[PDB]
């Protein structure tokens, strides 16, 4: 299980609520699935600009899922020899099919899911394809979910549309300087912060950013704060940051 | 190689700085101050600093790895370079390194230096076997995630440590 | 357990096969081992099928590699058996392919195996010294390489027909473009002239499969008759 | 398409009927650059090219590797068909893919009638191919003794040297034509002249035929 | 593949009623990564439908082996439309398809190899959608199966108000309105969650309906 949790960002509840949701109900209300018939979908797609932290974020709601969290990259799928897809994706359903309701997080799905018209995407078509196929025509599929993750939708797989597969779309933008002020506040709520911050100077210093890129401006603050001789953080530290890593 | 690998030696000092003024303490107060002061960046930040990344032209390369060894007050250090993974029979790497990080365990928060990260980085996924396992416990903070990162290169073509280096 | 290597097979060949005790009526001579040559060429296929058509008997197709085993001592089973057989049941014909790679000098014991199945060919070289009276089979051969065969087998008195095959098969390549285009749709614009002349610079095999090829790649439906661009089309490919 | 069957199977009053009511049939092609013209010659239709070139469809229409249709009616062996292109202004040295003409493949179907007419125009009688072949070196590949000669009839040259360096008399020989080797020495060939693989017209003879050539030569 | 799914529902009902076997030909098994001799798997496998007397096969997302070549293909496009041509000359070339038959499944009708859309092999055209309102009410009501909700009912809202919609993804935007009114924990659903969220939320189809 990991650290942080669902209570670290602020701002998007209206858009993870339904996702939190999709993850507490279908794991405490089993019960009330036969009275109504529900069957919770299996594919969702949390896509959006890279940056925005849509790894450490489902996981910090794998955290709530209280299962086993199963990290899985998408890269890893391209081998040397040949078959080994087989052998992943089978593995990815041999520990989900066969062990304790868990939760299975991917992401770069994008970097994979290329729909080429030899060609090493078009292994990747047998394999994801072959995934698909096992997304579709298994009807006990009703197990543990797939949850993924793409950090672009440039070239976007029409065949990812049904229940079973990536039907939950739930658009994750980049972040306004509001909502990097508040995810940045409450990742920033544990340093000595001065309490003269009125969020306007970084507010307008952080142009077209995203999550993890403020992360890293709290984490080197976090790291020159040390040696900056004053225990309380600044308020300089801020843009030293940004301008410093960006 | 692995306990061939062992290093304890005097070597070079810090008299031979190298002319970069500000560098020579950006890495200074990463390998001589947080030994020397374990509570003042507990209590002053959050941790100590994790390190700095010498890499980039050869040149006089190596002299300033000497130095670090040698300055410290206490013992010096262990070196590992990265030319002796690539070998024959694939797969020692992985009990190479958890064997000197469980090593690293036993001596009491010791700090281990890694060089010559382009000779496992940059078929390769049996060498992706070693690098990946190695990032993961490197990450991964169960020998430790503070006492020491640091990585020689001559080219910078290696993009996995690149995208992975970040977190650490 | 060319009208040469026609005319000289066929006299040589089929008109000793087609009677019996003739060896002994014609005041005996052993040109029973015919051996052919050419690597460029690809002979062996239809040469043996027209062999098989000509005649009506039993045929014996062993390539040179057919009792490369682990086993030393398969090949006296598996030829003698042969032996037996064609010598009891019909006048069959052996036909041993690319005697190069099992009829090399060797002197290490490293490849033993090489040697005792080239001394099984000494063997059966002795056998068939012993079967010059009244033999009931046909030992037809062919090979690609003559610089690294054993002086044993180019003995005269056991191979005394040695042909050839020459570089321009310019015959070969008219029957082999008039044994494919007279079933398949006719073009009155498909010229021979530049595809007789061109492989005759640039030599191959299997021209009959080249043509093949062409018609796989003229099943488009598109064009209704195959022309020239899958002609030298299917020659760029392969 | 559609029109490549009306236009391969003969259909008159389709093809007719399919044209006037579009026109636009008769200028569309297929996926491989061939319209109508090129199936109707193809096929060896009169009446259907003579509508097709009656409307005034452009003779030069040459398809993706470059085939004209005059090498269709050449190669076709009909002459109403090589009278229709070359009265529609037919170009007599197109190049085809190969960098041949309509001469080399009119020669290979010996046809007489369609060599004076395509010579009669205006044809090179010394047009060479990318490998620097002329019809002589395919007609005597072959043995097409009256199309070297009707080229003779329009002063053609015997002394080609192909890619390989060999006169339309090395190839003679090869062919082992005995008269046909015997017409070209006695019109002018070269008995000197030696290919890449330094071998004489002699040489390349065999059964003593040099000994026949060369006497000939000097007789 | 019009506005209107459960295709993959309505092969697998019959293949899984009886279908006399179940010989499914996935669109990722013609991926041949070596040399493109797939040739030997076209007749392989087809030649074991000539082998077996009963045969039926199913070809799902064809879209992807689809290719135009509209333009100059490349090698890994050559090889498919090669492919493509072992398919016409065993369906329009020397090879009768009389017992055997083939179920061609794709998404969209557009990239559809017009020279395979030929009367020869697909002879009718099934639209999967939901025009009938009596399909889409009857559709509702196998979906609405194991639902339970007040005793108000009135399904001819939503029919009337769906237009063009998937069959599958109707289920799922059916029972994301039991999720939307599960958010109250509520265990009896009135329908007004259902004509607002069936509502909405079909409307977000309709946006990402592109």
Same mark, same amino acid.
């Given at each position: 299980?990991?650290?942080?949790?669902?209570?670290?960002?602020?701002?998007?509840?209206?858009?993870?609520?339904?996702?939190?949701?999709?993850?507490?109900?279908?794991?405490?209300?089993?019960?009330?699935?036969?009275?109504?018939?529900?069957?919770?979908?299996?594919?969702?797609?949390?896509?959006?600009?890279?940056?925005?932290?849509?790894?450490?974020?489902?996981?910090?709601?794998?955290?709530?899922?209280?299962?086993?969290?199963?990290?899985?990259?998408?890269?890893?799928?391209?081998?040397?020899?040949?078959?080994?897809?087989?052998?992943?994706?089978?593995?990815?359903?041999?520990?989900?099919?066969?062990?304790?309701?868990?939760?299975?997080?991917?992401?770069?799905?994008?970097?994979?899911?290329?729909?080429?018209?030899?060609?090493?995407?078009?292994?990747?078509?047998?394999?994801?394809?072959?995934?698909?196929?096992?997304?579709?025509?298994?009807?006990?599929?009703?197990?543990?979910?797939?949850?993924?993750?793409?950090?672009?939708?440039?070239?976007?797989?029409?065949?990812?549309?049904?229940?079973?597969?990536?039907?939950?779309?739930?658009?994750?933008?980049?972040?306004?300087?509001?909502?990097?002020?508040?995810?940045?506040?409450?990742?920033?709520?544990?340093?000595?912060?001065?309490?003269?911050?009125?969020?306007?100077?970084?507010?307008?210093?952080?142009?077209?950013?995203?999550?993890?890129?403020?992360?890293?401006?709290?984490?080197?603050?976090?790291?020159?704060?040390?040696?900056?001789?004053?225990?309380?953080?600044?308020?300089?530290?801020?843009?030293?940051?940004?301008?410093?890593?960006? | 190689?692995?306990?061939?690998?062992?290093?304890?030696?005097?070597?070079?000092?810090?008299?031979?700085?190298?002319?970069?003024?500000?560098?020579?303490?950006?890495?200074?107060?990463?390998?001589?101050?947080?030994?020397?002061?374990?509570?003042?960046?507990?209590?002053?930040?959050?941790?100590?600093?994790?390190?700095?990344?010498?890499?980039?032209?050869?040149?006089?390369?190596?002299?300033?790895?000497?130095?670090?060894?040698?300055?410290?007050?206490?013992?010096?250090?262990?070196?590992?370079?990265?030319?002796?993974?690539?070998?024959?029979?694939?797969?020692?790497?992985?009990?190479?390194?958890?064997?000197?990080?469980?090593?690293?365990?036993?001596?009491?928060?010791?700090?281990?230096?890694?060089?010559?990260?382009?000779?496992?980085?940059?078929?390769?996924?049996?060498?992706?076997?070693?690098?990946?396992?190695?990032?993961?416990?490197?990450?991964?903070?169960?020998?430790?995630?503070?006492?020491?990162?640091?990585?020689?290169?001559?080219?910078?073509?290696?993009?996995?440590?690149?995208?992975?280096?970040?977190?650490? | 357990?060319?009208?040469?290597?026609?005319?000289?097979?066929?006299?040589?060949?089929?008109?000793?096969?087609?009677?019996?005790?003739?060896?002994?009526?014609?005041?005996?001579?052993?040109?029973?081992?015919?051996?052919?040559?050419?690597?460029?060429?690809?002979?062996?296929?239809?040469?043996?099928?027209?062999?098989?058509?000509?005649?009506?008997?039993?045929?014996?197709?062993?390539?040179?590699?057919?009792?490369?085993?682990?086993?030393?001592?398969?090949?006296?089973?598996?030829?003698?058996?042969?032996?037996?057989?064609?010598?009891?049941?019909?006048?069959?014909?052996?036909?041993?392919?690319?005697?190069?790679?099992?009829?090399?000098?060797?002197?290490?014991?490293?490849?033993?195996?090489?040697?005792?199945?080239?001394?099984?060919?000494?063997?059966?070289?002795?056998?068939?010294?012993?079967?010059?009276?009244?033999?009931?089979?046909?030992?037809?051969?062919?090979?690609?390489?003559?610089?690294?065969?054993?002086?044993?087998?180019?003995?005269?008195?056991?191979?005394?027909?040695?042909?050839?095959?020459?570089?321009?098969?310019?015959?070969?390549?008219?029957?082999?473009?008039?044994?494919?285009?007279?079933?398949?749709?006719?073009?009155?614009?498909?010229?021979?002239?530049?595809?007789?002349?061109?492989?005759?610079?640039?030599?191959?095999?299997?021209?009959?499969?080249?043509?093949?090829?062409?018609?796989?790649?003229?099943?488009?439906?598109?064009?209704?008759?195959?022309?020239?661009?899958?002609?030298?089309?299917?020659?760029?490919?392969? | 398409?559609?029109?490549?069957?009306?236009?391969?199977?003969?259909?008159?009053?389709?093809?007719?009927?399919?044209?006037?009511?579009?026109?636009?049939?008769?200028?569309?092609?297929?996926?491989?650059?061939?319209?109508?013209?090129?199936?109707?010659?193809?096929?060896?239709?009169?009446?259907?090219?003579?509508?097709?070139?009656?409307?005034?469809?452009?003779?030069?229409?040459?398809?993706?590797?470059?085939?004209?249709?005059?090498?269709?009616?050449?190669?076709?062996?009909?002459?109403?068909?090589?009278?229709?292109?070359?009265?529609?202004?037919?170009?007599?040295?197109?190049?085809?893919?190969?960098?041949?003409?309509?001469?080399?493949?009119?020669?290979?179907?010996?046809?007489?009638?369609?060599?004076?007419?395509?010579?009669?125009?205006?044809?090179?009688?010394?047009?060479?191919?990318?490998?620097?072949?002329?019809?002589?070196?395919?007609?005597?590949?072959?043995?097409?003794?009256?199309?070297?000669?009707?080229?003779?009839?329009?002063?053609?040259?015997?002394?080609?040297?192909?890619?390989?360096?060999?006169?339309?008399?090395?190839?003679?020989?090869?062919?082992?034509?005995?008269?046909?080797?015997?017409?070209?020495?006695?019109?002018?060939?070269?008995?000197?002249?030696?290919?890449?693989?330094?071998?004489?017209?002699?040489?390349?003879?065999?059964?003593?035929?040099?000994?026949?050539?060369?006497?000939?030569?000097?007789? | 593949?019009?506005?209107?799914?459960?295709?993959?529902?309505?092969?697998?009902?019959?293949?899984?009623?009886?279908?006399?076997?179940?010989?499914?030909?996935?669109?990722?098994?013609?991926?041949?990564?070596?040399?493109?001799?797939?040739?030997?798997?076209?007749?392989?496998?087809?030649?074991?439908?000539?082998? #077996?007397?009963?045969? =039926?096969?199913?070809?799902? *997302? !064809? @879209?992807?082996?689809?290719?135009?070549?509209? $333009?100059? +293909?490349?090698?890994?496009?050559?090889?498919?439309?090669?492919?493509?041509?072992?398919?016409?000359?065993?369906?329009?070339?020397?090879?009768?398809?009389?017992?055997?038959?083939?179920?061609?499944?794709?998404?969209?009708?557009?990239?559809?190899?017009?020279?395979?859309?030929?009367?020869?092999?697909?002879?009718?055209?099934?639209?999967?959608?939901?025009?009938?309102?009596?399909?889409?009410?009857?559709?509702?009501?196998? #979906?609405?199966?194991? =639902?339970?909700?007040?005793? *108000? !009912? @009135?399904?001819?809202?939503?029919?009337?108000? $769906?237009? +063009?919609?998937?069959?599958?993804?109707?289920?799922?935007?059916?029972?994301?309105?039991?999720?939307?009114?599960?958010?109250?924990?509520?265990?009896?659903?009135?329908?007004?969650?259902?004509?607002?969220?069936?509502?909405?939320?079909?409307?977000?189809?309709?946006?990402?309906?592109?």
């Amino acid at each position: 299980r990991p650290t942080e949790q669902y209570s670290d960002i602020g701002g998007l509840d209206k858009q993870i609520q339904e996702l939190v949701e999709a993850i507490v109900l279908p794991m405490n209300h089993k019960e009330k699935f036969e009275n109504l018939g529900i069957q919770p979908p299996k594919g969702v797609l949390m896509y959006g600009p890279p940056g925005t932290g849509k790894t450490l974020l489902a996981r910090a709601c794998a955290a709530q899922t209280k299962a086993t969290f199963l990290k899985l990259a998408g890269p890893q799928l391209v081998q040397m020899f040949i078959g080994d897809g087989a052998k992943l994706v089978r593995d990815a359903f041999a520990l989900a099919k066969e062990k304790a309701p868990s939760i299975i997080f991917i992401d770069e799905l994008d970097a994979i899911g290329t729909k080429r018209f030899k060609a090493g995407d078009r292994e990747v078509q047998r394999t994801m394809l072959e995934l698909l196929n096992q997304l579709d025509g298994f009807q006990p599929n009703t197990q543990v979910k797939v949850i993924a993750a793409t950090n672009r939708v440039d070239i976007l797989d029409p065949a990812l549309l049904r229940s079973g597969r990536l039907d939950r779309k739930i658009e994750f933008p980049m972040p306004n300087e509001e909502a990097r002020a508040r995810i940045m506040q409450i990742h920033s709520r544990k340093m000595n912060v001065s309490p003269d911050v009125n969020y306007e100077e970084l507010a307008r210093c952080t142009d077209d950013f995203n999550g993890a890129q403020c992360k890293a401006v709290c984490v080197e603050a976090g790291m020159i704060a040390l040696r900056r001789g004053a225990t309380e953080l600044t308020h300089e530290d801020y843009m030293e940051g940004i301008l410093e890593v960006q | 190689v692995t306990m061939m690998q062992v290093e304890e030696k005097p070597d070079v000092t810090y008299s031979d700085v190298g002319g970069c003024k500000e560098q020579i303490e950006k890495l200074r107060e990463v390998v001589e101050t947080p030994l020397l002061h374990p509570e003042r960046f507990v209590n002053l930040g959050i941790e100590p600093p994790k390190g700095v990344l010498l890499f980039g032209p050869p040149g006089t390369g190596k002299t300033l790895c000497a130095r670090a060894v040698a300055n410290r007050t206490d013992a010096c250090f262990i070196r590992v370079i990265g030319s002796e993974l690539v070998q024959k029979y694939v797969g020692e790497g992985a009990r190479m390194v958890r064997e000197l990080f469980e090593m690293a365990r036993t001596k009491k928060a010791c700090l281990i230096f890694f060089d010559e990260i382009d000779a496992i980085g940059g078929g390769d996924n049996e060498v992706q076997r070693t690098m990946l396992e190695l990032i993961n416990q490197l990450d991964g903070f169960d020998p430790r995630g503070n006492i020491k990162v640091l990585m020689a290169t001559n080219r910078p073509d290696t993009l996995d440590p690149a995208l992975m280096r970040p977190g650490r | 357990p060319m009208d040469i290597q026609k005319q000289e097979v066929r006299e040589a060949v089929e008109l000793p096969l087609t009677h019996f005790e003739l060896y002994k009526q014609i005041g005996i001579d052993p040109p029973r081992g015919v051996l052919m040559y050419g690597p460029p060429g690809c002979g062996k296929t239809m040469l043996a099928k027209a062999v098989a058509h000509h005649t009506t008997a039993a045929f014996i197709r062993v390539v040179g590699s057919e009792f490369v085993q682990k086993y030393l001592g398969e090949g006296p089973r598996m030829v003698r058996d042969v032996f037996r057989l064609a010598k009891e049941n019909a006048p069959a014909i052996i036909f041993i392919d690319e005697i190069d790679a099992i009829a090399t000098k060797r002197f290490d014991a490293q490849t033993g195996a090489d040697r005792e199945v080239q001394r099984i060919l000494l063997e059966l070289l002795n056998q068939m010294d012993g079967f010059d009276q009244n033999v009931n089979v046909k030992v037809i051969m062919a090979t690609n390489r003559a610089d690294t065969l054993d002086p044993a087998l180019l003995r005269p008195g056991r191979l005394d027909r040695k042909i050839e095959f020459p570089l321009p098969d310019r015959r070969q390549k008219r029957l082999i473009f008039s044994t494919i285009t007279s079933k398949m749709n006719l073009s009155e614009e498909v010229d021979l002239e530049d595809y007789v002349a061109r492989p005759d610079k640039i030599s191959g095999a299997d021209i009959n499969s080249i043509c093949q090829e062409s018609g796989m790649l003229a099943v488009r439906e598109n064009r209704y008759i195959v022309l020239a661009k899958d002609f030298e089309k299917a020659y760029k490919t392969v | 398409l559609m029109v490549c069957n009306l236009a391969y199977s003969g259909k008159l009053e389709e093809l007719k009927e399919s044209i006037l009511a579009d026109k636009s049939l008769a200028t569309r092609t297929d996926q491989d650059s061939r319209t109508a013209l090129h199936w109707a010659c193809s096929a060896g239709h009169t009446e259907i090219v003579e509508f097709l070139l009656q409307l005034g469809v452009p003779v030069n229409d040459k398809d993706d590797a470059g085939w004209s249709p005059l090498h269709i009616a050449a190669s076709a062996g009909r002459d109403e068909i090589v009278k229709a292109l070359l009265g529609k202004g037919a170009q007599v040295n197109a190049v085809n893919q190969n960098g041949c003409t309509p001469l080399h493949y009119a020669a290979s179907k010996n046809r007489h009638e369609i060599a004076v007419m395509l010579l009669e125009g205006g044809a090179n009688p010394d047009a060479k191919d990318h490998y620097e072949a002329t019809a002589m070196h395919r007609a005597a590949a072959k043995g097409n003794l009256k199309m070297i000669h009707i080229l003779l009839y329009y002063k053609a040259s015997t002394n080609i040297q192909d890619t390989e360096g060999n006169t339309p008399l090395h190839l003679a020989c090869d062919e082992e034509r005995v008269e046909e080797a015997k017409l070209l020495v006695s019109q002018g060939a070269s008995i000197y002249i030696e290919n890449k693989e330094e071998k004489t017209p002699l040489q390349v003879a065999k059964g003593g035929l040099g000994l026949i050539l060369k006497r000939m030569v000097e007789g | 593949g019009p506005p209107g799914t459960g295709k993959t529902l309505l092969a697998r009902a019959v293949a899984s009623q009886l279908d006399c076997n179940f010989l499914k030909v996935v669109s990722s098994s013609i991926v041949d990564k070596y040399i493109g001799e797939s040739a030997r798997l076209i007749r392989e496998m087809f030649n074991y439908a000539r082998d #077996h007397q009963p045969c =039926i096969i199913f070809m799902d *997302e !064809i @879209d992807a082996i689809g290719g135009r070549r509209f $333009s100059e +293909g490349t090698s890994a496009d050559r090889e498919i439309q090669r492919t493509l041509m072992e398919l016409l000359n065993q369906m329009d070339g020397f090879d009768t398809l009389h017992r055997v038959k083939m179920i061609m499944a794709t998404n969209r009708p557009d990239t559809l190899d017009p020279a395979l859309l030929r009367p020869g092999r697909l002879d009718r055209k099934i639209h999967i959608d939901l025009p009938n309102e009596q399909a889409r009410l009857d559709i509702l009501k196998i #979906h609405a199966g194991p =639902i339970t909700k007040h005793g *108000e !009912i @009135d399904y001819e809202a939503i029919v009337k108000l $769906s237009d +063009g919609f998937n069959g599958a993804d109707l289920r799922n935007v059916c029972t994301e309105a039991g999720m939307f009114a599960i958010r109250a924990d509520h265990d009896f659903v009135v329908q007004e969650d259902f004509m607002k969220a069936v509502r909405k939320v079909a409307d977000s189809k309709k946006l990402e309906s592109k």
